[PDB]
Amino acid sequence: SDNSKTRVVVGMSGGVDSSVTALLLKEQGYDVIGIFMKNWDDTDCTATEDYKDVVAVADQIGIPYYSVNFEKEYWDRVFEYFLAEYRAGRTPNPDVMCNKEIKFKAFLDYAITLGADYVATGHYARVARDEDGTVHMLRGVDNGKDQTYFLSQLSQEQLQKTMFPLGHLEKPEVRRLAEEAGLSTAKKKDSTGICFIGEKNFKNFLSNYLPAQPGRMMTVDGRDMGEHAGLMYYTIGQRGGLGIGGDNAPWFVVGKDLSKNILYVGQGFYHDSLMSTSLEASQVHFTREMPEEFTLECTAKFRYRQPDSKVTVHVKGEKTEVIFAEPQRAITPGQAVVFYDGEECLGGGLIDNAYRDGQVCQYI
Amino acid sequence: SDNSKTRVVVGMSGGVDSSVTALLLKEQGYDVIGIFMKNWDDTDCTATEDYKDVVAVADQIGIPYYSVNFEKEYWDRVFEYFLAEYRAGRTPNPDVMCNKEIKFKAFLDYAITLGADYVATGHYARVARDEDGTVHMLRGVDNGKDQTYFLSQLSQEQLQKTMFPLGHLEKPEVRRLAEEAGLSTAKKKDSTGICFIGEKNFKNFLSNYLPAQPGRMMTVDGRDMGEHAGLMYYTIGQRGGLGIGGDNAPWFVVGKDLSKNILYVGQGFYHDSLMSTSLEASQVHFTREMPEEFTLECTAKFRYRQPDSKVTVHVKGEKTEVIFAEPQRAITPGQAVVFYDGEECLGGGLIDNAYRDGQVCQYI
Numbered sequence A, B: 001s002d003n004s005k006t007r008v009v010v011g012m013s014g015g016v017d018s019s020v021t022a023l024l025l026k027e028q029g030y031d032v033i034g035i036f037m038k039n040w041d042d043t044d045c046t047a048t049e050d051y052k053d054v055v056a057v058a059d060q061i062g063i064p065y066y067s068v069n070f071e072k073e074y075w076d077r078v079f080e081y082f083l084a085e086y087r088a089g090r091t092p093n094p095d096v097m098c099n100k101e102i103k104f105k106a107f108l109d110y111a112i113t114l115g116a117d118y119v120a121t122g123h124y125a126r127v128a129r130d131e132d133g134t135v136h137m138l139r140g141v142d143n144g145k146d147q148t149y150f151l152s153q154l155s156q157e158q159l160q161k162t163m164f165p166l167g168h169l170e171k172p173e174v175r176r177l178a179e180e181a182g183l184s185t186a187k188k189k190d191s192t193g194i195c196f197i198g199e200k201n202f203k204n205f206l207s208n209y210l211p212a213q214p215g216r217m218m219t220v221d222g223r224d225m226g227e228h229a230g231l232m233y234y235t236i237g238q239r240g241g242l243g244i245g246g247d248n249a250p251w252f253v254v255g256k257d258l259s260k261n262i263l264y265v266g267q268g269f270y271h272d273s274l275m276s277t278s279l280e281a282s283q284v285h286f287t288r289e290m291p292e293e294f295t296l297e298c299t300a301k302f303r304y305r306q307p308d309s310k311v312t313v314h315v316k317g318e319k320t321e322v323i324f325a326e327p328q329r330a331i332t333p334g335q336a337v338v339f340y341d342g343e344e345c346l347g348g349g350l351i352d353n354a355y356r357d358g359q360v361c362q363y364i
């Protein structure tokens, strides 16, 4: 009856992570409520079979479960952001936006109306409380699944009401815990790609919302290489792609020019156009109150699947400058830059533009 | 017709990684042959539907495909190792053994009888050739999927005949490449866990081969906590487990004693029994010719899903000593220790035992 006085609302997606998150919290004696969000209307439906799994699991462990719909909020705060990024020639990170605006804003206020003390999710991340009571976010110990990158926008006030029960676990353990508990989701494979596109063709999906305007593909010396399918189908640094058959060696996307509808391509993983020495970022947000203007010597991640690297960051309110210790490959406008201090995730922003020798890279 | 003179035999498992590995090599003009290994007899069969995918993909890209059976070799060189580890109270890494003895020995010699110049696999790793022509292994750029850890045992002579076409790719890209090529495996989810156990219950699997002898579960101060199911069902550091319901806080496995059939358990992620300051390792193997006796200041990984950490290693032929810069949690006998020099994977061994203050940890 210690933890039984603490109500935790757990986001239950129907996956093995959230199923295990719920089981662990129940086992620790918390007052646990499972909640399924339907945030996307995808009918031939996807949400229907996942809700079945939420129900089967919630019943297996004996917790209440409910179902809430945030289609509107998700559309307005995530999907419009997603589309507007593409219109601007950038590459969005809808998950960052989703955590910031949905999982820890809409869902958190919702959970509070259920008398929740905390929300929990199956994110691979940790929260540590200070002596002072200040909460810090730490990388998940599973350094392949560590989701702090996507949680970079969370505020002190959100982290105060958050729990991450999987934070000290590695993915295979989560599956072992599920199997030993006999949870029906134990063997359920995780959905890949963005939630709302699911297992549908990406080009087809996006073209339902944005007009694709094929344009010209060029090498850096100006030689026309054919037609691309629309710039929003390519990202800085990508190997091959729609109509990139272009020598046997592969071609990469090495720049973009939205204003001429041009895709720049070139050979070599380390193509000189792919290298940067600094960036600017917007929407820079920290996990705690920071000064108006300050310098930081830390590490950063520019993409989810890379190790972090040394960085000087100069913050000045509306814009942030990031200087790389070492040249960086394929720094992508729209993606998240996330700052670390060893195991602590300090916060992050969205990349506006890359620079090499005091001149904006033609990335777009 | 440049690369068309180079024959590459690609290991095709039926998964999206190997499918894409084959497509990329074909696209680059290599003389490509896809080969499926059946190494485990698992009938109600698993191999049957995967071979269908190999065939569908090989036909989609227009390469020849064949099928070879190494059940014997796999049993003898991997599965017996796996079982013998458990009998000895250790935790095996069958993948390390499998790459060393099967994918790059049995399969490589096989491929050579097909006039192969190289074997390729869909491992997330890189090989770089020196000025001198010496090959080094580099981490995959996808730092979550990077498989150098499992490839730590590969010799210079194996790496000379190896290609890793996915080495410069991240997993989501591999899926985008697959989808754009219209490969039937594009949406196919990767199988989790060890190959031969697949989606069957682990406890059930292992008990078909090893007698489980339940024994006593004890805290570090000697208090009997109940019966465990058999020591081979638990690993150093694991949270909960079979019969670990044991306060609301979770219990961890903090040691083992095979000689008394005892499982030691304790509360707290950082339980003092979980911390080590050094280890010894056997089967230490490097990617290049090394001296008989030498010191190395580098980093190491003690488990697949952790970042590497600073380490002094003293090598002396039969045994290797590893001294941690910082105390290490749940150092597990039988697991791989793998050494790095920045992005280079130097080699590795199998952990024999952990030490704290010149005394072997009771891990077993």
Ligand SMILES: C[S@+](CC[C@H](N)C(=O)[O-])C[C@H]1O[C@@H](n2cnc3c(N)ncnc32)[C@H](O)[C@@H]1O
Pocket: A010, A011, A012, A013, A015, A017, A018, A021, A035, A036, A037, A038, A039, A095, A096, A098, A099, A103, A120, A121, A122, A123, A147, A150, A151
């Ligand atoms: C799998 S998502 C993480 C993927 C991505 N990196 C991100 O941050 O969105 C992590 C957690 O969010 C919560 N979640 C995701 N979808 C949900 C849904 N439809 N309803 C309730 N919770 C959900 C679950 O607790 C889940 O374990």
Ligand SMILES: C[S@+](CC[C@H](N)C(=O)[O-])C[C@H]1O[C@@H](n2cnc3c(N)ncnc32)[C@H](O)[C@@H]1O
Pocket: B010, B011, B012, B013, B015, B017, B018, B021, B035, B036, B037, B038, B039, B095, B096, B098, B099, B103, B120, B121, B122, B123, B147, B150, B151
């Ligand atoms: C998915 S396995 C990697 C998993 C594990 N970390 C390891 O090293 O074994 C990597 C590659 O091995 C090859 N491979 C695995 N199973 C195979 C099979 N049955 N037949 C042929 N190749 C296989 C494929 O090329 C595959 O992409």
Ligand SMILES: [Mg+2]
Pocket: A013, A014, A015, A016, A017, A018, A019, A122
């Ligand atoms: Mg989940």
Ligand SMILES: [Mg+2]
Pocket: B013, B014, B015, B016, B017, B018, B019, B122
């Ligand atoms: Mg594969």
